[PDB]
Nucleic acid binder design. Structure first.
Lengths: 79, 96, 206, 114, 278, 151
RNA sequence: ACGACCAGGGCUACACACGUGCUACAAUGGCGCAUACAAAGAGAAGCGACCUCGCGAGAGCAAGCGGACCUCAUAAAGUGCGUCGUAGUCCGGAUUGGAGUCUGCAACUCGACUCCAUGAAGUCGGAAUCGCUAGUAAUCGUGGAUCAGAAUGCCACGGUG
RNA sequence: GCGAAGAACCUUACCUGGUCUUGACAUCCACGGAAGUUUUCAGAGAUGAGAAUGUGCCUUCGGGAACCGUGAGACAGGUG
């Protein structure tokens, strides 16, 4: 792997991860934002980033963490 | 091109005095160890659109974000297309 | 038209500079912007007073647009207004303050330009391009030239083509290149197809 | 020694004969081998094995051989286990150190196929 | 001309006209308008009477499954009968040419061996063996006599519900079988609008004698290949590009022939056809 | 060159022999476009040839090249599409050019270290007229003077 | 509205074929070391020394000098020795691993950098193209251009040939 | 290695989802914001919602110029 010194988060989205705390790991959240990065703080749910159409929930299996929500989540679709 | 691929770009600036604040080219003079001092590395309840990478280089004449060239304000079409006749204080192509 | 024309190579080589201002690189583009923002403007401004060539300088970087016009008189206009507004614009659109300079053409029939446009503004009236052309190309060979060629492309008579038909008249080259080849095009963009008008005037050779 | 880049990286220009001799890659395989100073312009089997095997041991404290290959496998796996894009591609059988799938994806998608 | 739009199937090409059997079944010799052109016998048409003469002003020629130069004759030909006898010389490439085409077109060949009766115990056998090559290759053989019009039921039943056609060479008793099938002779021959007939057990048949003494039609290379699917399998056999189905080291197709994994004829035919377009 | 026919160009030689023979030849290998380093591994060979010739490096070449060079050839240009087969005198610009090339073309990409050797091993053999290059002198002349039936 | 906005995805997918490239293969080649002659490109949001470090990435810091003022920025092939000994090699590098580093809002998809670990095919290219005849083939560096971010390419760049 | 001298999204148009529709842009007019400003919050953002500030000449601080859109047509729109 290789590090972008800075990873990321986003506030409306981060706010929502806390919403999936006080609303727990309920069911997947929807932001279209994928700029924010996967963490175990993203455990709080499994979280759905737009990938055109698809707001795909990302697993908060945090051997994927240096990995934004689009890493885990779909993007394109293909054979 | 169209009005729009050009037209898009004018509309982006407004919300900031009705709603927000001001911070324009000063948000990330913090975000390294310039010396990551998180201070404007942490908001997004507020619009997402806009970054200099979301910025592209619209041809002036067409709005063409791409095809674009750093020496004319245009995309290449209009570059060459302007370039050959002159009304310019010099140009040449004479085996070059 | 089709080709990288005769003017498939000619750029500034032995060509007097309409911008001629020694601006310099950093603003150069912008000198041109301004240049061609007054040119853009200028050609709109003396679009009846008959600018035949706008030249731009910025002497000491102070735009100085030089007009060759079919008639300076209309270009100066009654009581200097027509040049005034150019001062306004040009100062304020070339940035580098307007000097606006008026001169009287050599001959508009030696203008590729004039001739084409003329022929367009002839055509537009409901005259023929033949008439319109004819008359100009004639009276350009008459003396207003000693060659003159038109060499068109796009919808000719409204056909499913765009290949050379032309109206050379006199001694006109297109390939012995250090030729005074006043070259322009106009067109009646047509509400049938497109008519390209492309009008050269051979003013001689160099 | 063999130096856990399992073979006597000798004879050759000879540390570099462990780049690709696993574990000890290029770097470690040098730093091991010069932990007894054996030639690397020429051989490493030309000297006292026990000074090199201590290195074999020293490097039996580096990421090596089976375990590192295993590591490699494991780590690779890790990705998938979560599912990723590194995961995804690997789980797509698709390169996780890349090569176009429209075009000649072939070392990682067999050295050529229609 | 105009009339009243009505459906019909074009029973016959009336030369100048086309004769249309209506939806009802009523045959009308019809004109064929300057306006329409995609017409063939078999087309379901909008034809109109006059205000017999009809006029045709709509057609329905369904998708390709056979041509000459390269121009569909009809459609719903789900089977091509490649019918032969030896007149006036013959070759394995000629049946195969038709086979390759059947295979290309994805129209089923039922390979019919005429004159089976003509062919002696040795001859019939030889010919059957040859017929078998194709058969083995996948194209069933029906032994018929041209003349005796044998195996007529297996053929007929193959015809049921589908349209069939008669291919071959100089009145190789194709014409004879056709007569049997019809149960009315409508052709003999010995040494694209034409006419169509309808089968009772179901399905239809299309005929022309002109086709039958032979020349042949324009085509493309891939089709010949399509004519032989075993080559695809060989294409895979050497390289990720197998030379070109023909010799050169690592030509699997060629190898498969060398082996005899493919029959030779397929390759041979591949060539007669290949050359002709070129 | 149908109008006015030709040999080689921008060649570079030796600062110690000045030999063109050696020049067009040292060069040949280039398609490395730089005999600023080409020349070197041939000398080891021509050195071993120098010895083998009983001469110098220069004249190590010489011997082997004079074996190599053709004295006749058969030439083609295809007059009319015609199969020329008549015996002809190999032109010098070819003699040399082709010959020089032939020696060089006989020590190629190989199987062990150092061309020095590879060349050395080609070189004396061409010296002895049983090199590949010399055998092209001794094969082209065999086709010559035995066929002249066709135009 | 196709106008048109945005979000986010999409090229670039993948059995793939193909072109059109890129790259190996090596032998002086890979490999270690030693070691000169290029030129041409680029600067003030500038270029950017020093400086500083980082193998590097990077990272920290930073003069000169709008350029024959400084600096980006510098040829390398060249050249002086070993090594290895066309070994899938030090070839060769796919592949991957594993992590640094980078750019871009963020690259996570569809962004860029080092180390480390890993090191296919490839060994000279079947069938099968063109090119080319000199500064071409062909080759060494070199560079620009503009892209927010990317030059297998283009656009450039001079050496050697 | 075809038009990006850049396709992450953006760009972007196009998927695909989400927007808008006198239209995204336009133009005047009204109109409001003069102009224009100061700042908060929330939404994927589209945008949605807050508070702040200043308006200079003429002057419905609207207007006019501000300068924008709206709104609305007139008008505006298209690389549709």
């Amino acid at each position: 792997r290789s590090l972008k010194k800075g990873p990321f988060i986003d506030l409306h989205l981060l706010k929502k991860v806390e919403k999936a705390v006080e609303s727990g790991d309920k069911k997947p959240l929807r932001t279209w934002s994928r700029r924010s990065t996967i963490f175990p703080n993203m455990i709080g749910l499994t979280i759905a980033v737009h990938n055109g159409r698809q707001h795909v929930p990302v697993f908060v299996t945090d051997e994927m963490v240096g990995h934004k929500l689009g890493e885990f989540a779909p993007t394109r679709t293909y054979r | 091109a169209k009005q729009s691929m050009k037209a898009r770009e004018v509309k982006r600036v407004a919300l900031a005095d009705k709603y927000f604040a001001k911070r324009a080219e000063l948000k990330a003079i913090i975000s390294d160890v310039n010396a990551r001092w998180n201070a404007v590395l942490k908001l997004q309840t507020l619009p997402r659109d806009s970054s200099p990478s979301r910025q592209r280089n619209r041809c002036r004449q067409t709005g063409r974000p791409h095809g674009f060239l750093r020496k004319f304000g245009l995309s290449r079409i209009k570059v060459r297309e302007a370039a050959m006749r002159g009304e310019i204080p010099g140009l040449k192509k004479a085996s070059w | 038209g089709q080709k990288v024309h005769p003017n498939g190579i000619r750029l500034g080589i032995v060509k007097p500079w309409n911008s001629t201002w020694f601006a310099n690189t950093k603003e150069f583009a912008d000198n041109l912007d301004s240049d061609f923002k007054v040119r853009q403007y200028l050609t709109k401004e003396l679009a009846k007073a008959s600018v035949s060539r706008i030249v731009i300088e910025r002497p000491a970087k102070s735009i100085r647009v030089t007009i060759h016009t079919a008639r300076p008189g209309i270009v100066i206009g009654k009581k200097g207004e027509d040049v005034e507004k150019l001062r306004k614009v040009v100062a304020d659109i070339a940035g580098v303050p307007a000097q606006i300079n008026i001169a009287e053409v050599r001959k508009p029939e030696l203008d590729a330009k004039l001739v084409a446009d003329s022929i367009t503004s002839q055509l537009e009236r409901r005259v023929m391009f033949r008439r319109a052309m004819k008359r100009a190309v004639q009276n350009a060979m008459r003396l207003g030239a000693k060659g003159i060629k038109v060499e068109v492309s796009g919808r000719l008579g409204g056909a499913e083509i765009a290949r050379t038909e032309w109206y050379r008249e006199g001694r006109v080259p297109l390939h012995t290149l250090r030729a005074d080849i006043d070259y322009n095009t106009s067109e009646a963009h047509t509400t049938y197809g497109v008519i390209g008008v492309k009008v050269w005037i051979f003013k001689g050779e160099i | 020694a063999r130096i856990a880049g399992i073979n006597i990286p000798d004879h050759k220009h000879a540390v570099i004969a462990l780049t690709s001799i696993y574990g000890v890659g290029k770097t470690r395989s040098k730093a091991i081998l010069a932990a007894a100073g054996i030639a690397e312009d020429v051989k490493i089997s030309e000297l006292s094995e026990g000074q090199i095997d201590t290195l074999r041991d020293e490097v039996a404290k580096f990421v090596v051989e089976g375990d590192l290959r295993r590591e490699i496998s494991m780590s690779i796996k890790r990705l998938m286990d979560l599912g990723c894009y590194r995961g995804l591609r690997h789980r797509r059988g698709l390169p996780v150190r890349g090569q176009r799938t429209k075009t000649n994806a072939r070392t990682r998608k067999g050295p050529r196929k229609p | 001309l105009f009339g009243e739009p009505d459906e019909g199937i074009v029973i016959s090409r009336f030369g100048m006209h086309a004769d249309v059997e209506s939806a009802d079944g009523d045959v009308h010799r019809c004109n064929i308008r300057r306006t329409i052109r995609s017409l063939v016998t078999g087309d379901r048409v909008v034809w109109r009477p006059g205000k017999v003469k009809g006029i045709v002003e709509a057609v329905h020629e369904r998708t390709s499954v056979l041509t000459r130069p390269v121009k569909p004759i009809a459609a719903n030909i789900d089977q091509i009968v490649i019918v032969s006898a030896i007149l006036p010389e013959l070759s394995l490439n000629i049946i195969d040419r038709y086979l390759v085409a059947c295979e290309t077109l994805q129209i089923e060949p039922i390979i019919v061996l005429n004159k089976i009766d003509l062919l002696d115990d040795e001859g019939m056998a030889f010919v059957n063996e040859q017929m078998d090559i194709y058969r083995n290759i996948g194209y069933r053989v029906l032994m018929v006599s041209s003349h005796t019009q044998d195996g007529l039921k297996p053929l007929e039943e193959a015809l049921t519900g589908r349209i069939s056609i008669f291919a071959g060479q100089s009145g190789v008793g194709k014409s004879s079988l056709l007569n049997a099938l019809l149960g009315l002779q409508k052709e003999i021959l010995t040494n694209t609008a034409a006419r169509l007939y309808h089968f009772p057990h179901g399905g239809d048949v299309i005929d022309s004698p002109g086709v039958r003494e032979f020349g042949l039609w324009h085509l493309e290379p891939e089709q010949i290949t399509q004519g032989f699917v075993e080559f695809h399998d060989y294409l895979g056999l050497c390289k990720y590009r197998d030379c070109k189905h023909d010799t050169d080291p690592g030509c699997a197709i060629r190898e498969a022939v060398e082996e005899g994994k493919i029959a030779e004829t397929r390759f041979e035919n591949y060539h007669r056809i290949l050359e002709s377009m070129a | 060159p149908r109008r006015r026919v030709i040999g080689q160009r921008k060649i570079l030689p030796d600062p110690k022999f000045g030999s063109e023979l050696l020049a067009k030849f040292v060069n040949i290998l280039m398609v490395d476009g730089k005999k600023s380093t080409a020349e070197s591994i041939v000398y080891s060979a021509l050195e071993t040839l120098a010895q083998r010739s009983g001469k110098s490096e220069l004249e190590a070449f010489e011997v082997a090249l004079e074996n190599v060079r053709p004295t006749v050839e058969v030439k083609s240009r295809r007059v009319g599409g015609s199969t020329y087969q008549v015996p002809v005198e190999v032109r010098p610009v070819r003699r040399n050019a082709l010959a020089m090339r032939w020696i060089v073309e006989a020590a190629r990409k190989r199987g062990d270290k150092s061309m020095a050797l590879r060349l050395a091993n080609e070189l004396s053999d061409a010296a002895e007229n049983k090199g590949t290059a010399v055998k092209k002198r001794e094969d082209v002349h065999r086709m010559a003077e035995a066929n002249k039936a066709f135009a």
